[PDB]
PDB file of C-alpha atoms and ligand atoms in Angstrom:
ATOM      1  CA  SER P   1     -14.905 -50.270 -75.053  1.00  0.00           C
ATOM      2  CA  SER P   2     -14.228 -48.359 -78.177  1.00  0.00           C
ATOM      3  CA  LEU P   3     -15.411 -45.082 -76.562  1.00  0.00           C
ATOM      4  CA  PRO P   4     -15.161 -43.736 -73.032  1.00  0.00           C
ATOM      5  CA  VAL P   5     -18.156 -44.199 -70.739  1.00  0.00           C
ATOM      6  CA  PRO P   6     -19.768 -41.810 -69.764  1.00  0.00           C
ATOM      7  CA  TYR P   7     -19.536 -40.506 -73.326  1.00  0.00           C
ATOM      8  CA  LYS P   8     -20.427 -36.828 -73.849  1.00  0.00           C
ATOM      9  CA  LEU P   9     -20.959 -36.044 -77.465  1.00  0.00           C
ATOM     10  CA  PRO P  10     -21.670 -32.543 -78.563  1.00  0.00           C
ATOM     11  CA  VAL P  11     -24.497 -32.529 -81.148  1.00  0.00           C
ATOM     12  CA  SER P  12     -26.841 -30.441 -83.209  1.00  0.00           C
ATOM     13  CA  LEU P  13     -30.207 -32.217 -83.653  1.00  0.00           C
ATOM     14  CA  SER P  14     -33.005 -31.272 -85.962  1.00  0.00           C
ATOM     15  CA  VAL P  15     -36.125 -33.019 -87.306  1.00  0.00           C
ATOM     16  CA  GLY P  16     -34.833 -36.012 -89.306  1.00  0.00           C
ATOM     17  CA  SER P  17     -31.727 -36.589 -87.219  1.00  0.00           C
ATOM     18  CA  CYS P  18     -31.062 -40.190 -85.994  1.00  0.00           C
ATOM     19  CA  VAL P  19     -28.811 -41.095 -83.062  1.00  0.00           C
ATOM     20  CA  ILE P  20     -27.513 -44.744 -83.397  1.00  0.00           C
ATOM     21  CA  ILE P  21     -25.802 -46.200 -80.279  1.00  0.00           C
ATOM     22  CA  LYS P  22     -24.183 -49.615 -80.435  1.00  0.00           C
ATOM     23  CA  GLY P  23     -22.863 -51.292 -77.342  1.00  0.00           C
ATOM     24  CA  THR P  24     -22.922 -54.198 -74.855  1.00  0.00           C
ATOM     25  CA  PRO P  25     -23.919 -54.438 -71.208  1.00  0.00           C
ATOM     26  CA  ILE P  26     -21.005 -55.210 -68.989  1.00  0.00           C
ATOM     27  CA  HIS P  27     -22.956 -57.424 -66.615  1.00  0.00           C
ATOM     28  CA  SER P  28     -25.384 -60.231 -67.133  1.00  0.00           C
ATOM     29  CA  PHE P  29     -29.048 -59.347 -66.717  1.00  0.00           C
ATOM     30  CA  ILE P  30     -29.374 -61.163 -63.276  1.00  0.00           C
ATOM     31  CA  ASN P  31     -26.925 -58.402 -62.066  1.00  0.00           C
ATOM     32  CA  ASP P  32     -29.225 -55.616 -63.424  1.00  0.00           C
ATOM     33  CA  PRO P  33     -26.937 -53.499 -65.509  1.00  0.00           C
ATOM     34  CA  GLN P  34     -28.336 -50.150 -66.586  1.00  0.00           C
ATOM     35  CA  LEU P  35     -28.086 -48.083 -69.779  1.00  0.00           C
ATOM     36  CA  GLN P  36     -28.743 -44.388 -69.730  1.00  0.00           C
ATOM     37  CA  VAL P  37     -29.069 -41.773 -72.569  1.00  0.00           C
ATOM     38  CA  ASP P  38     -29.593 -38.083 -71.879  1.00  0.00           C
ATOM     39  CA  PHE P  39     -30.329 -35.436 -74.458  1.00  0.00           C
ATOM     40  CA  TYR P  40     -28.753 -32.472 -72.584  1.00  0.00           C
ATOM     41  CA  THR P  41     -29.252 -28.782 -73.357  1.00  0.00           C
ATOM     42  CA  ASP P  42     -25.660 -28.007 -72.508  1.00  0.00           C
ATOM     43  CA  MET P  43     -22.414 -29.807 -71.777  1.00  0.00           C
ATOM     44  CA  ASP P  44     -22.956 -29.185 -68.084  1.00  0.00           C
ATOM     45  CA  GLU P  45     -24.517 -32.213 -66.496  1.00  0.00           C
ATOM     46  CA  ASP P  46     -26.754 -30.003 -64.259  1.00  0.00           C
ATOM     47  CA  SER P  47     -28.344 -28.417 -67.390  1.00  0.00           C
ATOM     48  CA  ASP P  48     -31.856 -29.259 -68.419  1.00  0.00           C
ATOM     49  CA  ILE P  49     -32.609 -32.530 -70.217  1.00  0.00           C
ATOM     50  CA  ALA P  50     -35.024 -32.737 -73.177  1.00  0.00           C
ATOM     51  CA  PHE P  51     -35.112 -36.531 -73.059  1.00  0.00           C
ATOM     52  CA  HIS P  52     -33.815 -38.947 -70.417  1.00  0.00           C
ATOM     53  CA  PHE P  53     -33.815 -42.675 -71.223  1.00  0.00           C
ATOM     54  CA  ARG P  54     -32.859 -45.151 -68.481  1.00  0.00           C
ATOM     55  CA  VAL P  55     -33.009 -48.896 -69.191  1.00  0.00           C
ATOM     56  CA  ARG P  56     -32.882 -51.449 -66.312  1.00  0.00           C
ATOM     57  CA  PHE P  57     -32.039 -54.486 -68.544  1.00  0.00           C
ATOM     58  CA  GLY P  58     -34.465 -57.431 -68.337  1.00  0.00           C
ATOM     59  CA  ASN P  59     -36.855 -55.199 -66.306  1.00  0.00           C
ATOM     60  CA  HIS P  60     -38.193 -51.851 -67.659  1.00  0.00           C
ATOM     61  CA  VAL P  61     -37.318 -48.480 -69.139  1.00  0.00           C
ATOM     62  CA  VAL P  62     -37.920 -45.041 -67.467  1.00  0.00           C
ATOM     63  CA  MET P  63     -38.152 -41.812 -69.482  1.00  0.00           C
ATOM     64  CA  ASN P  64     -38.461 -38.265 -68.284  1.00  0.00           C
ATOM     65  CA  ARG P  65     -37.194 -34.700 -68.813  1.00  0.00           C
ATOM     66  CA  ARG P  66     -35.795 -32.146 -66.472  1.00  0.00           C
ATOM     67  CA  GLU P  67     -37.011 -28.546 -66.832  1.00  0.00           C
ATOM     68  CA  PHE P  68     -35.850 -25.674 -64.758  1.00  0.00           C
ATOM     69  CA  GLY P  69     -33.838 -28.206 -62.857  1.00  0.00           C
ATOM     70  CA  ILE P  70     -36.865 -30.310 -61.819  1.00  0.00           C
ATOM     71  CA  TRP P  71     -37.711 -33.827 -63.039  1.00  0.00           C
ATOM     72  CA  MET P  72     -41.082 -33.880 -64.691  1.00  0.00           C
ATOM     73  CA  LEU P  73     -43.733 -36.698 -64.938  1.00  0.00           C
ATOM     74  CA  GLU P  74     -41.989 -40.067 -65.371  1.00  0.00           C
ATOM     75  CA  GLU P  75     -43.020 -42.284 -68.318  1.00  0.00           C
ATOM     76  CA  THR P  76     -42.323 -46.038 -68.503  1.00  0.00           C
ATOM     77  CA  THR P  77     -42.593 -49.044 -70.666  1.00  0.00           C
ATOM     78  CA  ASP P  78     -41.906 -52.765 -69.945  1.00  0.00           C
ATOM     79  CA  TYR P  79     -40.938 -53.587 -73.553  1.00  0.00           C
ATOM     80  CA  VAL P  80     -37.164 -53.812 -73.442  1.00  0.00           C
ATOM     81  CA  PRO P  81     -36.242 -56.333 -76.144  1.00  0.00           C
ATOM     82  CA  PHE P  82     -32.477 -56.444 -75.249  1.00  0.00           C
ATOM     83  CA  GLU P  83     -30.682 -59.836 -75.357  1.00  0.00           C
ATOM     84  CA  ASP P  84     -28.641 -60.961 -72.344  1.00  0.00           C
ATOM     85  CA  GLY P  85     -24.865 -60.570 -73.080  1.00  0.00           C
ATOM     86  CA  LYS P  86     -25.141 -59.403 -76.721  1.00  0.00           C
ATOM     87  CA  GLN P  87     -24.424 -56.201 -78.541  1.00  0.00           C
ATOM     88  CA  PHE P  88     -27.510 -53.945 -78.860  1.00  0.00           C
ATOM     89  CA  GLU P  89     -28.524 -51.252 -81.389  1.00  0.00           C
ATOM     90  CA  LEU P  90     -30.380 -48.291 -79.943  1.00  0.00           C
ATOM     91  CA  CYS P  91     -31.751 -45.871 -82.510  1.00  0.00           C
ATOM     92  CA  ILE P  92     -33.431 -42.548 -81.435  1.00  0.00           C
ATOM     93  CA  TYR P  93     -34.965 -40.828 -84.369  1.00  0.00           C
ATOM     94  CA  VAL P  94     -36.050 -37.225 -84.078  1.00  0.00           C
ATOM     95  CA  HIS P  95     -39.640 -36.706 -85.516  1.00  0.00           C
ATOM     96  CA  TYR P  96     -41.369 -33.380 -85.678  1.00  0.00           C
ATOM     97  CA  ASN P  97     -43.386 -34.112 -82.557  1.00  0.00           C
ATOM     98  CA  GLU P  98     -41.559 -36.968 -80.811  1.00  0.00           C
ATOM     99  CA  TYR P  99     -38.460 -39.127 -80.338  1.00  0.00           C
ATOM    100  CA  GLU P 100     -38.998 -42.494 -81.749  1.00  0.00           C
ATOM    101  CA  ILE P 101     -37.044 -45.147 -79.798  1.00  0.00           C
ATOM    102  CA  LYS P 102     -35.998 -48.387 -81.403  1.00  0.00           C
ATOM    103  CA  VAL P 103     -34.165 -51.305 -79.795  1.00  0.00           C
ATOM    104  CA  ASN P 104     -32.556 -53.740 -82.161  1.00  0.00           C
ATOM    105  CA  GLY P 105     -34.825 -52.548 -84.893  1.00  0.00           C
ATOM    106  CA  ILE P 106     -38.074 -52.642 -82.804  1.00  0.00           C
ATOM    107  CA  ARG P 107     -40.008 -49.472 -82.028  1.00  0.00           C
ATOM    108  CA  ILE P 108     -40.638 -49.393 -78.252  1.00  0.00           C
ATOM    109  CA  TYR P 109     -41.788 -45.876 -77.606  1.00  0.00           C
ATOM    110  CA  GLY P 110     -42.444 -42.345 -78.874  1.00  0.00           C
ATOM    111  CA  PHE P 111     -41.464 -39.701 -76.340  1.00  0.00           C
ATOM    112  CA  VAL P 112     -43.174 -36.386 -77.310  1.00  0.00           C
ATOM    113  CA  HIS P 113     -41.175 -33.174 -77.319  1.00  0.00           C
ATOM    114  CA  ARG P 114     -41.898 -30.664 -74.592  1.00  0.00           C
ATOM    115  CA  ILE P 115     -39.027 -28.530 -75.768  1.00  0.00           C
ATOM    116  CA  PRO P 116     -37.802 -28.330 -79.369  1.00  0.00           C
ATOM    117  CA  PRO P 117     -35.088 -30.909 -80.160  1.00  0.00           C
ATOM    118  CA  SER P 118     -32.924 -28.211 -81.555  1.00  0.00           C
ATOM    119  CA  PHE P 119     -32.239 -27.204 -77.902  1.00  0.00           C
ATOM    120  CA  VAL P 120     -30.284 -30.444 -77.518  1.00  0.00           C
ATOM    121  CA  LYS P 121     -26.475 -29.622 -77.495  1.00  0.00           C
ATOM    122  CA  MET P 122     -25.036 -32.809 -76.072  1.00  0.00           C
ATOM    123  CA  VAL P 123     -25.865 -36.501 -75.894  1.00  0.00           C
ATOM    124  CA  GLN P 124     -24.466 -38.404 -72.919  1.00  0.00           C
ATOM    125  CA  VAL P 125     -24.410 -42.173 -72.975  1.00  0.00           C
ATOM    126  CA  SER P 126     -23.746 -43.629 -69.415  1.00  0.00           C
ATOM    127  CA  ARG P 127     -23.898 -46.420 -66.879  1.00  0.00           C
ATOM    128  CA  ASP P 128     -23.131 -50.180 -67.226  1.00  0.00           C
ATOM    129  CA  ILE P 129     -22.232 -50.622 -70.894  1.00  0.00           C
ATOM    130  CA  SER P 130     -19.316 -50.821 -73.193  1.00  0.00           C
ATOM    131  CA  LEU P 131     -19.657 -48.706 -76.419  1.00  0.00           C
ATOM    132  CA  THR P 132     -18.904 -49.794 -79.934  1.00  0.00           C
ATOM    133  CA  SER P 133     -20.027 -46.758 -81.809  1.00  0.00           C
ATOM    134  CA  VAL P 134     -22.178 -43.678 -81.750  1.00  0.00           C
ATOM    135  CA  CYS P 135     -23.485 -42.151 -85.057  1.00  0.00           C
ATOM    136  CA  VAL P 136     -25.614 -39.086 -85.783  1.00  0.00           C
ATOM    137  CA  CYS P 137     -27.219 -39.182 -89.135  1.00  0.00           C
ATOM    138  CA  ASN P 138     -29.394 -36.868 -91.280  1.00  0.00           C
TER     139      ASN P 138
ATOM    140  CA  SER O   1     -32.493 -34.650-102.821  1.00  0.00           C
ATOM    141  CA  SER O   2     -33.101 -35.913 -99.280  1.00  0.00           C
ATOM    142  CA  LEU O   3     -31.241 -32.941 -97.740  1.00  0.00           C
ATOM    143  CA  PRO O   4     -31.072 -29.222 -98.824  1.00  0.00           C
ATOM    144  CA  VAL O   5     -27.903 -28.195-100.864  1.00  0.00           C
ATOM    145  CA  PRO O   6     -25.780 -26.316 -99.750  1.00  0.00           C
ATOM    146  CA  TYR O   7     -26.086 -28.395 -96.583  1.00  0.00           C
ATOM    147  CA  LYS O   8     -24.644 -26.802 -93.437  1.00  0.00           C
ATOM    148  CA  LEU O   9     -24.303 -29.245 -90.583  1.00  0.00           C
ATOM    149  CA  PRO O  10     -23.089 -28.024 -87.184  1.00  0.00           C
ATOM    150  CA  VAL O  11     -20.566 -30.627 -85.907  1.00  0.00           C
ATOM    151  CA  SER O  12     -18.076 -31.394 -83.204  1.00  0.00           C
ATOM    152  CA  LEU O  13     -15.167 -33.450 -84.529  1.00  0.00           C
ATOM    153  CA  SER O  14     -12.420 -35.247 -82.774  1.00  0.00           C
ATOM    154  CA  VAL O  15      -9.806 -37.818 -83.639  1.00  0.00           C
ATOM    155  CA  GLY O  16     -11.681 -40.923 -84.524  1.00  0.00           C
ATOM    156  CA  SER O  17     -14.664 -39.049 -86.026  1.00  0.00           C
ATOM    157  CA  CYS O  18     -15.847 -40.134 -89.502  1.00  0.00           C
ATOM    158  CA  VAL O  19     -17.926 -37.972 -91.808  1.00  0.00           C
ATOM    159  CA  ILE O  20     -19.873 -40.139 -94.343  1.00  0.00           C
ATOM    160  CA  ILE O  21     -21.517 -38.313 -97.220  1.00  0.00           C
ATOM    161  CA  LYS O  22     -23.823 -40.119 -99.732  1.00  0.00           C
ATOM    162  CA  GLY O  23     -25.142 -38.424-102.864  1.00  0.00           C
ATOM    163  CA  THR O  24     -25.305 -38.268-106.578  1.00  0.00           C
ATOM    164  CA  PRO O  25     -24.060 -35.663-109.140  1.00  0.00           C
ATOM    165  CA  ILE O  26     -26.896 -33.876-110.912  1.00  0.00           C
ATOM    166  CA  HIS O  27     -25.146 -33.666-114.241  1.00  0.00           C
ATOM    167  CA  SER O  28     -23.246 -36.207-116.324  1.00  0.00           C
ATOM    168  CA  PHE O  29     -19.573 -35.979-116.313  1.00  0.00           C
ATOM    169  CA  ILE O  30     -19.237 -34.355-119.728  1.00  0.00           C
ATOM    170  CA  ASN O  31     -21.039 -31.414-118.249  1.00  0.00           C
ATOM    171  CA  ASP O  32     -18.418 -31.168-115.323  1.00  0.00           C
ATOM    172  CA  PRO O  33     -20.483 -31.196-112.139  1.00  0.00           C
ATOM    173  CA  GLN O  34     -18.582 -30.281-109.026  1.00  0.00           C
ATOM    174  CA  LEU O  35     -18.833 -31.463-105.370  1.00  0.00           C
ATOM    175  CA  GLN O  36     -17.551 -29.394-102.520  1.00  0.00           C
ATOM    176  CA  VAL O  37     -16.985 -30.226 -98.843  1.00  0.00           C
ATOM    177  CA  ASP O  38     -15.768 -27.550 -96.378  1.00  0.00           C
ATOM    178  CA  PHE O  39     -14.724 -28.150 -92.820  1.00  0.00           C
ATOM    179  CA  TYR O  40     -15.567 -24.674 -91.472  1.00  0.00           C
ATOM    180  CA  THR O  41     -14.488 -23.205 -88.121  1.00  0.00           C
ATOM    181  CA  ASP O  42     -17.891 -21.371 -87.731  1.00  0.00           C
ATOM    182  CA  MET O  43     -21.328 -21.334 -89.262  1.00  0.00           C
ATOM    183  CA  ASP O  44     -20.388 -18.033 -91.137  1.00  0.00           C
ATOM    184  CA  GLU O  45     -19.188 -19.014 -94.610  1.00  0.00           C
ATOM    185  CA  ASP O  46     -16.498 -16.328 -94.359  1.00  0.00           C
ATOM    186  CA  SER O  47     -14.861 -18.122 -91.406  1.00  0.00           C
ATOM    187  CA  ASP O  48     -11.586 -19.960 -91.735  1.00  0.00           C
ATOM    188  CA  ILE O  49     -11.612 -23.512 -93.330  1.00  0.00           C
ATOM    189  CA  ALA O  50      -9.595 -26.265 -91.830  1.00  0.00           C
ATOM    190  CA  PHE O  51     -10.021 -28.479 -94.907  1.00  0.00           C
ATOM    191  CA  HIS O  52     -11.619 -27.559 -98.284  1.00  0.00           C
ATOM    192  CA  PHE O  53     -12.288 -30.436-100.858  1.00  0.00           C
ATOM    193  CA  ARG O  54     -13.475 -29.615-104.223  1.00  0.00           C
ATOM    194  CA  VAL O  55     -14.032 -32.370-106.889  1.00  0.00           C
ATOM    195  CA  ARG O  56     -14.364 -31.724-110.623  1.00  0.00           C
ATOM    196  CA  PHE O  57     -15.980 -35.009-111.580  1.00  0.00           C
ATOM    197  CA  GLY O  58     -13.934 -37.023-114.154  1.00  0.00           C
ATOM    198  CA  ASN O  59     -11.106 -34.572-113.806  1.00  0.00           C
ATOM    199  CA  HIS O  60      -9.330 -33.841-110.614  1.00  0.00           C
ATOM    200  CA  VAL O  61      -9.707 -32.847-106.895  1.00  0.00           C
ATOM    201  CA  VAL O  62      -8.321 -29.639-105.305  1.00  0.00           C
ATOM    202  CA  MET O  63      -7.766 -29.415-101.527  1.00  0.00           C
ATOM    203  CA  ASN O  64      -6.775 -26.417 -99.490  1.00  0.00           C
ATOM    204  CA  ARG O  65      -7.312 -24.434 -96.276  1.00  0.00           C
ATOM    205  CA  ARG O  66      -8.164 -20.866 -95.512  1.00  0.00           C
ATOM    206  CA  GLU O  67      -6.244 -19.245 -92.693  1.00  0.00           C
ATOM    207  CA  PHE O  68      -6.824 -15.642 -91.485  1.00  0.00           C
ATOM    208  CA  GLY O  69      -9.064 -15.273 -94.583  1.00  0.00           C
ATOM    209  CA  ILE O  70      -6.277 -16.376 -97.060  1.00  0.00           C
ATOM    210  CA  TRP O  71      -6.262 -19.438 -99.210  1.00  0.00           C
ATOM    211  CA  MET O  72      -3.120 -21.413 -98.541  1.00  0.00           C
ATOM    212  CA  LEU O  73      -1.021 -23.690-100.758  1.00  0.00           C
ATOM    213  CA  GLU O  74      -3.295 -25.811-102.890  1.00  0.00           C
ATOM    214  CA  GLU O  75      -2.894 -29.607-102.993  1.00  0.00           C
ATOM    215  CA  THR O  76      -4.287 -31.810-105.765  1.00  0.00           C
ATOM    216  CA  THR O  77      -4.852 -35.345-106.845  1.00  0.00           C
ATOM    217  CA  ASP O  78      -6.006 -36.838-110.180  1.00  0.00           C
ATOM    218  CA  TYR O  79      -7.399 -40.030-108.471  1.00  0.00           C
ATOM    219  CA  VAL O  80     -11.229 -39.367-108.370  1.00  0.00           C
ATOM    220  CA  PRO O  81     -12.822 -42.873-108.736  1.00  0.00           C
ATOM    221  CA  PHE O  82     -16.420 -41.625-108.901  1.00  0.00           C
ATOM    222  CA  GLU O  83     -18.749 -43.297-111.415  1.00  0.00           C
ATOM    223  CA  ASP O  84     -20.734 -41.221-113.914  1.00  0.00           C
ATOM    224  CA  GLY O  85     -24.399 -40.971-112.909  1.00  0.00           C
ATOM    225  CA  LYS O  86     -24.199 -43.146-109.803  1.00  0.00           C
ATOM    226  CA  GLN O  87     -24.536 -42.540-106.098  1.00  0.00           C
ATOM    227  CA  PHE O  88     -21.152 -42.066-104.419  1.00  0.00           C
ATOM    228  CA  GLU O  89     -20.011 -42.693-100.844  1.00  0.00           C
ATOM    229  CA  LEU O  90     -17.477 -40.046 -99.493  1.00  0.00           C
ATOM    230  CA  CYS O  91     -15.824 -40.881 -96.204  1.00  0.00           C
ATOM    231  CA  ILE O  92     -13.582 -38.378 -94.356  1.00  0.00           C
ATOM    232  CA  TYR O  93     -11.950 -39.932 -91.347  1.00  0.00           C
ATOM    233  CA  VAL O  94     -10.241 -37.696 -88.714  1.00  0.00           C
ATOM    234  CA  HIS O  95      -6.819 -39.236 -87.790  1.00  0.00           C
ATOM    235  CA  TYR O  96      -4.495 -37.728 -85.269  1.00  0.00           C
ATOM    236  CA  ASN O  97      -2.355 -36.013 -87.913  1.00  0.00           C
ATOM    237  CA  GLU O  98      -4.604 -35.984 -91.105  1.00  0.00           C
ATOM    238  CA  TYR O  99      -7.953 -36.290 -92.680  1.00  0.00           C
ATOM    239  CA  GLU O 100      -8.162 -39.496 -94.659  1.00  0.00           C
ATOM    240  CA  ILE O 101     -10.392 -39.220 -97.631  1.00  0.00           C
ATOM    241  CA  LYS O 102     -12.083 -42.251 -99.226  1.00  0.00           C
ATOM    242  CA  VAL O 103     -14.180 -42.324-102.317  1.00  0.00           C
ATOM    243  CA  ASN O 104     -16.498 -45.415-102.673  1.00  0.00           C
ATOM    244  CA  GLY O 105     -14.233 -47.300-100.264  1.00  0.00           C
ATOM    245  CA  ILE O 106     -10.969 -46.242-101.831  1.00  0.00           C
ATOM    246  CA  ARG O 107      -8.461 -44.060 -99.999  1.00  0.00           C
ATOM    247  CA  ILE O 108      -7.444 -41.200-102.324  1.00  0.00           C
ATOM    248  CA  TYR O 109      -5.552 -38.808-100.079  1.00  0.00           C
ATOM    249  CA  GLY O 110      -4.426 -37.811 -96.549  1.00  0.00           C
ATOM    250  CA  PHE O 111      -4.766 -34.066 -95.881  1.00  0.00           C
ATOM    251  CA  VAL O 112      -2.563 -33.121 -93.004  1.00  0.00           C
ATOM    252  CA  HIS O 113      -3.961 -30.880 -90.138  1.00  0.00           C
ATOM    253  CA  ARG O 114      -2.625 -27.420 -89.988  1.00  0.00           C
ATOM    254  CA  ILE O 115      -5.187 -26.544 -87.235  1.00  0.00           C
ATOM    255  CA  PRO O 116      -6.572 -29.105 -84.851  1.00  0.00           C
ATOM    256  CA  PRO O 117      -9.764 -30.809 -86.155  1.00  0.00           C
ATOM    257  CA  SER O 118     -11.575 -29.866 -82.943  1.00  0.00           C
ATOM    258  CA  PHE O 119     -11.692 -26.384 -84.311  1.00  0.00           C
ATOM    259  CA  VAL O 120     -14.196 -27.579 -86.953  1.00  0.00           C
ATOM    260  CA  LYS O 121     -17.731 -26.379 -86.042  1.00  0.00           C
ATOM    261  CA  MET O 122     -19.641 -26.891 -89.345  1.00  0.00           C
ATOM    262  CA  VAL O 123     -19.476 -29.109 -92.334  1.00  0.00           C
ATOM    263  CA  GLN O 124     -20.824 -27.596 -95.539  1.00  0.00           C
ATOM    264  CA  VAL O 125     -21.585 -29.879 -98.561  1.00  0.00           C
ATOM    265  CA  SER O 126     -22.200 -27.907-101.723  1.00  0.00           C
ATOM    266  CA  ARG O 127     -22.324 -27.572-105.531  1.00  0.00           C
ATOM    267  CA  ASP O 128     -23.814 -29.938-108.195  1.00  0.00           C
ATOM    268  CA  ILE O 129     -25.075 -32.848-106.196  1.00  0.00           C
ATOM    269  CA  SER O 130     -28.212 -34.312-104.660  1.00  0.00           C
ATOM    270  CA  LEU O 131     -27.647 -35.578-101.077  1.00  0.00           C
ATOM    271  CA  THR O 132     -28.999 -38.858 -99.753  1.00  0.00           C
ATOM    272  CA  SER O 133     -27.490 -38.736 -96.239  1.00  0.00           C
ATOM    273  CA  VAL O 134     -24.767 -37.268 -94.021  1.00  0.00           C
ATOM    274  CA  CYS O 135     -23.605 -39.137 -90.937  1.00  0.00           C
ATOM    275  CA  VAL O 136     -20.947 -38.335 -88.311  1.00  0.00           C
ATOM    276  CA  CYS O 137     -19.738 -41.325 -86.421  1.00  0.00           C
ATOM    277  CA  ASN O 138     -17.425 -42.082 -83.557  1.00  0.00           C
TER     278      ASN O 138
HETATM  279  O1  LIG I 201     -37.777 -40.273 -63.808  1.00  0.00           O
HETATM  280  C1  LIG I 201     -36.367 -40.301 -64.182  1.00  0.00           C
HETATM  281  C2  LIG I 201     -35.637 -40.036 -62.966  1.00  0.00           C
HETATM  282  O2  LIG I 201     -36.212 -40.782 -61.806  1.00  0.00           O
HETATM  283  C3  LIG I 201     -35.500 -40.742 -60.550  1.00  0.00           C
HETATM  284  O3  LIG I 201     -35.799 -41.801 -59.768  1.00  0.00           O
HETATM  285  C4  LIG I 201     -37.248 -41.776 -59.383  1.00  0.00           C
HETATM  286  C5  LIG I 201     -37.683 -43.145 -59.366  1.00  0.00           C
HETATM  287  O4  LIG I 201     -37.713 -43.619 -60.892  1.00  0.00           O
HETATM  288  C6  LIG I 201     -39.043 -43.328 -58.879  1.00  0.00           C
HETATM  289  O5  LIG I 201     -39.440 -44.733 -58.923  1.00  0.00           O
HETATM  290  C7  LIG I 201     -39.068 -42.780 -57.417  1.00  0.00           C
HETATM  291  O6  LIG I 201     -40.334 -42.872 -56.851  1.00  0.00           O
HETATM  292  O7  LIG I 201     -38.721 -41.354 -57.408  1.00  0.00           O
HETATM  293  C8  LIG I 201     -37.366 -41.203 -58.035  1.00  0.00           C
HETATM  294  C9  LIG I 201     -36.987 -39.668 -58.093  1.00  0.00           C
HETATM  295  O8  LIG I 201     -37.693 -39.144 -59.096  1.00  0.00           O
HETATM  296  C10 LIG I 201     -33.921 -40.877 -60.771  1.00  0.00           C
HETATM  297  O9  LIG I 201     -33.302 -40.526 -59.624  1.00  0.00           O
HETATM  298  C11 LIG I 201     -33.469 -39.981 -61.981  1.00  0.00           C
HETATM  299  O10 LIG I 201     -31.985 -40.169 -62.121  1.00  0.00           O
HETATM  300  C12 LIG I 201     -34.189 -40.158 -63.179  1.00  0.00           C
HETATM  301  O11 LIG I 201     -33.975 -41.526 -63.611  1.00  0.00           O
HETATM  302  O1  LIG I 202      -7.427 -23.864-103.620  1.00  0.00           O
HETATM  303  C1  LIG I 202      -8.744 -23.957-103.468  1.00  0.00           C
HETATM  304  C2  LIG I 202      -9.307 -22.685-103.860  1.00  0.00           C
HETATM  305  O2  LIG I 202      -8.862 -22.476-105.288  1.00  0.00           O
HETATM  306  C3  LIG I 202      -9.455 -21.246-105.905  1.00  0.00           C
HETATM  307  O3  LIG I 202      -9.230 -21.321-107.254  1.00  0.00           O
HETATM  308  C4  LIG I 202      -7.792 -21.246-107.572  1.00  0.00           C
HETATM  309  C5  LIG I 202      -7.555 -22.197-108.659  1.00  0.00           C
HETATM  310  O4  LIG I 202      -7.738 -23.561-108.175  1.00  0.00           O
HETATM  311  C6  LIG I 202      -6.185 -22.022-109.325  1.00  0.00           C
HETATM  312  O5  LIG I 202      -6.123 -22.964-110.361  1.00  0.00           O
HETATM  313  C7  LIG I 202      -5.937 -20.623-109.772  1.00  0.00           C
HETATM  314  O6  LIG I 202      -4.742 -20.471-110.313  1.00  0.00           O
HETATM  315  O7  LIG I 202      -6.088 -19.718-108.508  1.00  0.00           O
HETATM  316  C8  LIG I 202      -7.413 -19.850-107.973  1.00  0.00           C
HETATM  317  C9  LIG I 202      -7.551 -18.901-106.712  1.00  0.00           C
HETATM  318  O8  LIG I 202      -6.844 -19.534-105.697  1.00  0.00           O
HETATM  319  C10 LIG I 202     -10.969 -21.171-105.729  1.00  0.00           C
HETATM  320  O9  LIG I 202     -11.395 -19.927-106.127  1.00  0.00           O
HETATM  321  C11 LIG I 202     -11.396 -21.549-104.313  1.00  0.00           C
HETATM  322  O10 LIG I 202     -12.829 -21.581-104.178  1.00  0.00           O
HETATM  323  C12 LIG I 202     -10.853 -22.759-103.721  1.00  0.00           C
HETATM  324  O11 LIG I 202     -11.368 -23.839-104.500  1.00  0.00           O
END
């Protein structure tokens, strides 16, 4: 891996920001690797989470938020167009009302803001992946 | 311009970070547009500056830092391979001992750290340019 995992990046996000994550799962899909991205409101991992994104490769994605320390209503999609064994590109674009999530150029979901994205102070990338790069663009 | 100018981006920099700035001068070179990039230690524009980079297009570049409110010893280079009227790409890569500055893929200078780059909390891009994008990569 080019970066440590878990990778905790301090960030300032605004509408128009794009978080681009490139990496590779460290297990084949029959071994169910996971990839997790958390948009944290502080560096402390017990802080609230504006957007939690957990992929079970070859299976499904779960999304949620954590508010006042409580996990809210979970959202899910079965569209996870990752390829077994290959590097992926995960783009999270901050729109005015939602995070748009793209996997290898394919829009899979729009997760609507329940707190403003400017409250996000740290992005954590975790679980069963090797990381090539993380970019934050405006 | 795609972004406001002056553009003040809150950042966290570490060794291995790369700041990529894409834009276009808003005047032809015979009218001496300038481009300025400041690595500020706070959002306040009177805070100390770890790395100040001021291009006079078609002429020369000045670099400096501001410590305890005082401008230090100015450094300069005449290598400024920007093209009149065209979009440029300005990359500032954070090495362990210096900032490496590349203009349109060409390394022009290495500005050595006098305070650690982790002290940089805001990057300001200013003066006579239109901005296409600013990315911070690790
Ligand atoms: O919702 C994200 C959140 O889910 C937790 O796991 C859920 C699980 O997805 C669900 O199937 C089960 O019924 O309840 C669990 C508790 O909410 C995870 O523990 C948590 O880390 C998040 O991933
Ligand atoms: O060194 C960067 C700093 O320079 C100031 O201008 C200098 C100028 O470059 C020099 O030729 C003259 O002799 O002294 C001036 C004052 O230091 C700028 O005013 C400042 O904004 C920075 O660009």
